[PDB]
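Hi W., the zinc ion complex you wanted:
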Amino acid sequence: AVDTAEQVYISSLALLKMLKHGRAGVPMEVMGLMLGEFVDDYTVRVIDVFAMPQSVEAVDPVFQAKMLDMLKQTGRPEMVVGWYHSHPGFGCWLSGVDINTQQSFEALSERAVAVVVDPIQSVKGKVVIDAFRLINANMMVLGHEPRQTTSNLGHLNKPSIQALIHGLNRHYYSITINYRKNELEQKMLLNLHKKSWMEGLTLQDYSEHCKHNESVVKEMLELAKNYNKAVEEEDKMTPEQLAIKNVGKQDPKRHLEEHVDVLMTSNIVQCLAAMLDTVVFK
Amino acid sequence: MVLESTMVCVDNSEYMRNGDFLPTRLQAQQDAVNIVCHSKTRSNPENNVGLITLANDCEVLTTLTPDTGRILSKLHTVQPKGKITFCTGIRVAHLALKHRQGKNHKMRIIAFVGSPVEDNEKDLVKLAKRLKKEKVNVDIINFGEEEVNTEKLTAFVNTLNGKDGTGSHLVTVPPGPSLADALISSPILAG
Amino acid sequence: SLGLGLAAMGTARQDVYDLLKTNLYQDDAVTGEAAGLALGLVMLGSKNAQAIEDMVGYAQETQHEKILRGLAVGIALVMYGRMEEADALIESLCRDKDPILRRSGMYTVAMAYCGSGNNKAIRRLLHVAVSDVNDDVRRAAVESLGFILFRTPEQCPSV
Amino acid sequence: EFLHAQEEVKRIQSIPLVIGQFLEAVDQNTAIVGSTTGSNYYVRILSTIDRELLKPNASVALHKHSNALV
Amino acid sequence: AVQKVVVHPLVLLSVVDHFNRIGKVGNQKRVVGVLLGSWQKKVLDVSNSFAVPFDEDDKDDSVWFLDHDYLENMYGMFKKVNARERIVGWYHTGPKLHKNDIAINELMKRYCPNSVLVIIDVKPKDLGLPTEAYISVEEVHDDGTPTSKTFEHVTSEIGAEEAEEVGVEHLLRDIKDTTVGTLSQRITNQVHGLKGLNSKLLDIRSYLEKVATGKLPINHQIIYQLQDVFNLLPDVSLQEFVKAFYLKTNDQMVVVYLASLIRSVVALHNLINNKIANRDAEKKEG
Amino acid sequence: TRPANHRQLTFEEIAKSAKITVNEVELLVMKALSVGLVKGSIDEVDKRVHMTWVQPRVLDLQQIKGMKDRLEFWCTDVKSMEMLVEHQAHDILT
Ligand SMILES: [Zn+2]
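Structure:
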């Protein structure tokens, strides 16, 4: 018996169920169960996620047994592997009671996993997901992980400061997480932002189109007005004092490319679709 | 104490609307439901009861469940109107019991048939061997005019438990509200 | 099990390959290292097409990672220095979405092109070096150049 | 990759920042702001902000911990 | 009327997982679950969904089962956990909807005012928009149909939310994408559009040759309605329509002309800018 | 009859086919439009009655045949003309 370089296998539904639950209960720690499968001594796999009511102490486990039952009879039976909750705008660190449920859980199952989530620090590009694993204190001097591979040591990331200020190595150990993707969900997830041929065959309008070009050309004239004075101006001031006196209201040479780009991309497609609609049709 | 799942096929067809039984076939088959639900109740609370009709759109009024009070609530205002339908009754009772959460329970079925059926013996042999695959021993207690001496039903049963199976059985429908405790005096555990 | 094939690596022992196969088909993580390496190692240069079909056919349905890794190296080693028939497998492995099997194919093109100074594979190998998303098959991508540059070793430090 | 870079910087705000006021800038990407917390500070700025939004002490936001013009 | 619905990306995955659940049978096991949505407007919103046991034989498609008990308990749990959520309809993983599919809606029209169906496609070989939904009506016909009952196509779309866009689009990093690709998404648009046109034409001609000869019903269903489709067919090249194009196309050409005009000069500035710094730093360097 | 090539028929063919006088064809066509089986229009300086809309009628096998001819003749043009697009831009849209 010894630790390893463990891996956290996920379920794509699990992530969304996380973020929607925590976001909906954003002003407080929202709790829930992590349901999955113990694939081996090395890696874990979560496939199902769900939560319960909380007014953090969960109420009647009669929801528990009936929930897992009806989840077994429809679909199949599975195994509870861990759990999760939120640290809204927090250091995604196991709170004092959060660790207090951990001696409760690891005593039940060995590889009981805590799951920290914050729907606050997560930007649309990247989410701040987290999960931890309690460690004993009796072995505070004795080694805890054999470290037989670089992956969970010098191959992952670097512990953050706001959670290292709480445990960072102590009272628990971090764990790596990845994403397994079925090809079935993968293909449909690939395509969810395309439209039908109607969109690709629309001709927006030439009254508001020509009205629009008539718009942008107008102020673009003024942008050229400013651009003449600015470019010819050229105080011999060194290439950085210009970069300190340009903060303000100064903006030639910037809008000029922009309006040209937009006026390009409009007129181009606007002509092209009209072309196709006549070549192809009749 | 045995594990099973009772599936009853009540008859709300038109031909149940008569008095070959003393009060009415509705009260007769209803009371037989009273004795079957108490029977399985006293046998094993783990066992579960589900009912089905034989009307145009044969209905699962109660999903297979150990409680019987719901079935008793369903028995009232049963509205025995329509036409007796058999081959789709054993079918809807057939594909239903594969939706069971508990699989140790043996798929059992009892049917209350009290209207003239129009089935075929090749149909009862196909359905019979189909009931050989899952071994759904069904004991039907007929309540009213069913067929010529319950023909195509002892053939259905024997073609169900062929080669000395004797698990399914066929009752009779000529005198009245047979005390099913007397009908299953010896076959009290398995009719 | 891991060194079993490295010892019998030039002999091409079909006999050890046999029991190594059923060792590989245990559907486990502890035996994945047991068979996954020596299986191809005892078939180095063998080009046993049934061996390729076994390895790639089994590294599509598993659940562990070591059973993916030992196959990732065995499939890259089963073909040795061909440069002309391994192309179909290099494309088959690079077009994959497997974050390990692409990198498995990335190692492959290195061994199928052992030091190959062909400026053909350098285009798309060192192209998926650019557009590649997985860091694993990216590092395995850039780490095939020296494995394909003994013909002109002075060029690696320039690219 | 650069466009992926701009978006990932966005996590810094997350809303609860502080309401302060821009005061002045010393040089490129570093300025001075007097917060509504009564005190005044010397801070850096994000490269995302357009430099045309300055002048006459604009209403600005700042990080709680860092206290940077975001 | 509902006239359109907004389905979120969670569902269309919370169905795929369950098709995966009983997906071991392989041959055929139609996945049916409960659809959950919002009484938003005439337009309707769809947020949640869940499963329910369902089986059906091969012949005589009248033998199918939806556990009303399981539906009652599990939706009781989903109401206890979310009163904001509520039942709106249902779905099935059928690639093409079946003749049996009307009896299901007709059954559970008692829970929802109209339990709208939802057809999803696990394998949309078509690269268009999958997972379209219908809502049944009655269209009693001159023929003498006692109840001409058939579903109705209703336009739908994919929902969106701040958090779910975050988590999903962070997951989209596994593949490359050019969503900011200037004047590229358009070209892709007309490509996929014309592809849909050709697909539809090949389909309608497949049907049309079949009905034309040998064996197919020759009903008055479409046969002249699609003729009226031929009725429009604008005769592009004619007298004054030329004045439609040449009086505007050159207009947009003028704007494009000016844009290129300034773009060239702007590009020309940097030549002076760098040709100054190069040699001026060189001569001072030496 | 005419496939909308020159469907702005003049009064004369109406007065001959319906064999009504010329001064009544206007009152007849205005009645037909009042009914709504057609959406034509009326000129008097030339007395040409333009046709726009015809009610969809029943047809038969051969109409299905020429209809399939139009369908193929148009579909092939659509596909090939998209092939012109892809051919014109291969590595341009990525
Ligand atoms: Zn906490």
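The CA atoms of residues 102 and 148 of chain E lie 12 Å apart.

W.
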